[PDB]
Amino acid sequence: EFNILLATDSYKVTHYKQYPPNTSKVYSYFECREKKYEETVFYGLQYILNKYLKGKVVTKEKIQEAKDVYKEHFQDDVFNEKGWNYILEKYDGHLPIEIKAVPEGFVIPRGNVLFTVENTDPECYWLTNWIETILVQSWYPITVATNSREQKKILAKYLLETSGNLDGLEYKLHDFGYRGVSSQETAGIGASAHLVNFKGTDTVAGLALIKKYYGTKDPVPGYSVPAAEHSTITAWGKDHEKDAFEHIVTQFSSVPVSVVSDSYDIYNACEKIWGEDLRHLIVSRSTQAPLIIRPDSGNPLDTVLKVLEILGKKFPVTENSKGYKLLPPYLRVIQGDGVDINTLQEIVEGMKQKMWSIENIAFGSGGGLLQKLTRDLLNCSFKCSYVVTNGLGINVFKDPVADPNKRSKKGRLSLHRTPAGNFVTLEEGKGDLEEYGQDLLHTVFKNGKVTKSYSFDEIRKNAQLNIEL
Amino acid sequence: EFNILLATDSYKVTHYKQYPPNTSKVYSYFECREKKYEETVFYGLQYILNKYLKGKVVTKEKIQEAKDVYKEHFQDDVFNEKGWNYILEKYDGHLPIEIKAVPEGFVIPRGNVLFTVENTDPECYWLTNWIETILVQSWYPITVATNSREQKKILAKYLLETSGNLDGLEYKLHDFGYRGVSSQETAGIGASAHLVNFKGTDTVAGLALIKKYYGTKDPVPGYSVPAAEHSTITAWGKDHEKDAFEHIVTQFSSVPVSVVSDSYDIYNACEKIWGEDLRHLIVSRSTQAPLIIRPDSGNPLDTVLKVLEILGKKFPVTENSKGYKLLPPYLRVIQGDGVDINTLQEIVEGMKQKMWSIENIAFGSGGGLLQKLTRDLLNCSFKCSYVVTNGLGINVFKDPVADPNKRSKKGRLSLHRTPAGNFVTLEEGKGDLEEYGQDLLHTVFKNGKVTKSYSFDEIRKNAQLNIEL
Ligand SMILES: Cc1ccc(-n2cc3c(N4CCC[C@H](C(=O)NCc5ccc6sccc6c5)C4)ncnc3n2)cc1F
Ligand SMILES: Cc1ccc(-n2cc3c(N4CCC[C@H](C(=O)NCc5ccc6sccc6c5)C4)ncnc3n2)cc1F
Ligand SMILES: NC(=O)c1cccnc1
Ligand SMILES: NC(=O)c1cccnc1
Ligand SMILES: [Cl-]
């Protein structure tokens, strides 16, 4: 079982002896600091509140196990067994903490308060920063959702430019990162953060997380189609690649099917196997069940252009109303090797320069989508900004001399609409003056209970693009 | 509960229909492909075998749950219920799989088979690659352990050059990465891959993972010391940084204590507060309990050098037998910001040029140690190499025209010691010829049971550096 007593950085165990004497309150906030990723999607906190923070999280056994571990870990007795016993006996193991947060799915510019944490009992002044480590891991669902939405921005721009509309935009970036992430739990969290912006996923674990912690009107959060891998092609033997292709397309004749075609020679497969030997099987296919040719190797842009050029000469190409070339509706393409936000931009721009519509293509991303991201990318940070000591509050901050980018905000914080409809974070309790209207943070957690929640449908609506609205 | 049926890439649900008819065996292997990271530490598979693969992993309830999710996910009934029901009835939900692997902790050059997977029942030919996604996630503990051990090599070289020995080498790279990773489960896995090489960690989760899945003779795998964060300093007030310092070194007067000193001005704090105002508190400290000044900002190399020059002029420096300057034993330094393998190399090289011993310093790394890594880095791959169809085995592989690096191995594989003491992977069953001694691959899993396991103590032994030997 999970033990929140053992779910923190080791040094935090010793933090209670470091605060000034008579500290009654510790108040802290989370932000994506300014340093392009100018705006972030807030998503993932609700998962953490339910899975790890709500309910009876303290028991006598959990106190005892933390005791025994920390005695040997530090080779000394520094564990605050008294304060954890106080929480057990006084609150039946419920955390005396208040967390206020911007609604999930909201798109907020960099450098604004996203959530705040404070203790609701003077005796638990140390508890605020104890749970810093758990809460800061929200950087990851925030960064996946933000990085995924930025790629959707690129995709929407070139789809609209080459086709005249945004049809099928939500299926243009498909999650292929299950194997490429660091764990099963990461796969679920990251796939759900992708599904805030798109509908296509192969990481099954995201669907379960969404249903369990957020919910949707529809039965399934994400969708997928039948597809081949190298083992199901190569197992037929090198000389029988055509037999594998024919068997697979026939097996899924009425639904869309993706067939990786680069096992030996991608160019030969598109020109000779799909384009000649098996062309009859492809042309008969329905509009709703196209053959999706997937290259998996080589330079991502060079491969897509040569693949499209080959198919354009074996298959009937039309020109759409914007003047961009279109494969017949039974034939499409997916590029799922080496796709990240940077190469995605290079591919669609190169496709447009060669007059190919983005309608022809979808993208799969693995490591780029879920694994190649860090807390440093959006500068996610958690800092103390206000404490009460001897009954007097003081506005608290850091201001390192060698880096003004690491300066932290001062005092009690609030998030507001500006008169022009933008966002601003008010410092030093100044939101109490009511010059900017109402604080947009809501209490989402108080004294062990989740007090406000959002369905995954609300989050998706919140996270939409302007071009979509 | 965890459902193995919902723990794979979506398209693998459809793969049982794509293999050639009359296929009785699918045999697949894992390698860190060649393309410096010339050798990898094999670590982490035993965690996955116990947590996810062993025992009764299939139930009627699980099969039903999977059936309903996949019907909506694909908008088609494609799930192989008969195959999963066959496993329930014939083997009480135990997976008919055999996994052979190199012992954990072994240091193997790139491009060598590390483990193989095959089905043991002809009806379950599809199951070998169903569990590809689960197994491939071993890239992460392998990559953390490899990257951490390479940094230990760098540290070992420069400590030895500057001090004449390796005393304290195992404590020179400290895991700060708990908050910087993507999830709780990732934190446990990655911190345990670090403890294969070092003893210092602030990520408590990794300790429980080791004790539960690997084990140690010692009470705990990793250790830590009391340490301050910015909140415990800044909470005292901007004009009271000196009061916070003095309160903390007195609260932890008999154990080693790390104090972040860059809240406002790292160089003022070293020169004036530690250097003059609190110097008396410092000089009296024991060798066993030094003050560890920690800079958390600026250029990592420039800050460490300036910090050491400042301290060298306020405290009595000695010159060791190699001619390198040594702080007094009650005073040490830790750089725990912006540290990865590249900058770690720049720091110790810069310290050597300025004639500072590596004895003076340790390093703390967070994102670099546990989160800034991908499967691309060691090119961890899982590919099918052998199948039996119609009673005949055939050697299977991919060989994309665009990339020579993506070529896979052929046939049944074995791992051997060469005459010169190196390693070789024999293809096409040629290990049967017995010209190369015993296969170093061992059956670690068969038909639902873990058949050989290793203690964390033997893993640390296997992963030792040559310089340590
Ligand atoms: C693994 C994977 C599978 C499919 C898609 N995908 C669906 C698209 C879509 N839809 C959704 C289905 C009904 C309807 C539809 O016409 N389908 C067929 C279709 C159309 C275009 C493309 S391009 C690559 C595949 C494909 C398939 C509306 N519209 C636009 N682009 C879409 N891409 C992307 C993937 F990464
Ligand atoms: C968070 C943290 C804590 C300690 C270390 N750490 C211990 C070292 C060691 N030891 C081990 C303990 C007993 C004994 C010892 O002298 N201790 C105190 C000590 C000595 C050197 C240094 S340098 C930075 C900190 C520090 C502390 C022998 N020998 C060499 N270098 C060592 N670094 C590194 C960290 F990142
Ligand atoms: N459906 C796919 O093509 C896929 C899924 C997961 C990983 N790689 C590719
Ligand atoms: N002990 C430390 O100094 C520490 C731990 C975790 C994160 N940052 C710093
Ligand atoms: Cl209890």
Domain ranges of chain A: 1-135+375-453, 136-374+454-469
Provide the residue type at B170 as one letter: E
Instruction: Give one word for A442, left, alpha or beta, with left for phi > 0 and alpha for psi -120 to 50.
Output: beta
Judge whether A226 is closer than 8 Å to chain B, CB to CB. yes
Which residues lie closer than 8 Å to A434 by C-beta, 6 or more apart?
none
Closest residue to B137, CB basis, from A179, A255, A402: A179
List, as one string, the DSSP characters of A275-313: IIITHHHHHT--TTS-EEEE--SS-HHHHHHHHHHHHHH
Gap between the Cα atoms of A465 and A401, Å rounded:
39
Gap between the Cα atoms of A184 and B9, Å rounded:
12
Which residues lie closer than 8 Å to B82 by C-beta, 6 or more apart?
none
CA distances from A152 to A303, A340, A341, A427 (A): 22, 12, 10, 34
CB contact (8 A) between residue B231 and residue A28: yes
CB contacts under 8 A, A 377-396 vs B, are 382-384, 387, 389, 394, 396
Contacts of A75 in chain B (CB under 8 A): 223, 255
**Best of A12, A202, A204 to mutate (most B CBs within 10 Å, chain B):** A204
Rounded to the nearest whole angstrom, what is the distance from the C-alpha of residue A171 to the centroid of ligand 1?
6
Per-residue H/E/C for A321-374: CCCCEECCCCEEEEECCCCCHHHHHHHHHHHHHCCECHHHEEEEECHHHHCCCC
Gap between the Cα atoms of A187 and A176, Å rounded:
10
Four-CA torsion B156, B159, B165, B171, nearest 10 degrees: -70
Gap between the Cα atoms of A94 and B116, Å rounded:
47
- List residues bridging with B113 in a β-sheet: B31
Tell whether residue A294 is among the known ligand binding residues.
Answer: yes
Gap between the Cα atoms of A224 and B70, Å rounded:
9
Provide the residue type at B452 as one letter: K
**Best of A137, A143, A144, A182 to mutate (most B CBs within 10 Å, chain B):** A182
Judge whether A14 is closer than 8 Å to chain B, CB to CB. yes
Place of tokens 């993507």: B182
Gap between the Cα atoms of A16 and A93, Å rounded:
19
Residue nearest to atom 8 of ligand 4 (CA): B176
Q: In which element (H, E) is residue B148 found?
A: helix B139-163
Contacts of A273 in chain B (CB under 8 A): none
Q: How far is A94 from chain B (nearest CA, A)?
A: 21
Q: Could you tell me if the CB of B171 is within 6 A of ligand 2?
A: yes
Rounded to the nearest whole angstrom, what is the distance from the C-alpha of residue A189 to the centroid of ligand 3?
18
> B300-314 and B341-353 helices cross at what angle (nearest 10)?
40
CB contact (8 A) between residue B224 and residue A76: no
| Helix and strand element counts for chain B (H, E) | 15, 18
Gap between the Cα atoms of A381 and A30, Å rounded:
6
CB contact (8 A) between residue B400 and residue A185: no
B151, B155, B159, B171: which to mutate for ligand 2, most atoms within 8 A of CB? B171
Contacts of B224 in chain A (CB under 8 A): 10-11, 73-74
Judge whether B374 is closer than 8 Å to chain A, CB to CB. yes
**Which residue intervals of B177-265 are DSSP H helices?**
184-195, 205-213, 230-234, 241-251
Which residues lie closer than 8 Å to A202 by C-beta, 6 or more apart?
A174, A175, A176, A178, A224, B9, B10, B11
R_g of chain A, CA atoms, integer Å:
26
- Classified as helix, coil or strand, B24 is strand
Per-residue H/E/C for B262-292: CCCCHHHHHHHHHHHHCHHHHHCCCCCCCEE
Number of residues that this document lists for chain A: 469
The answer to whether the beta carbons of residues B155 and B172 sit under 8 Å apart is yes
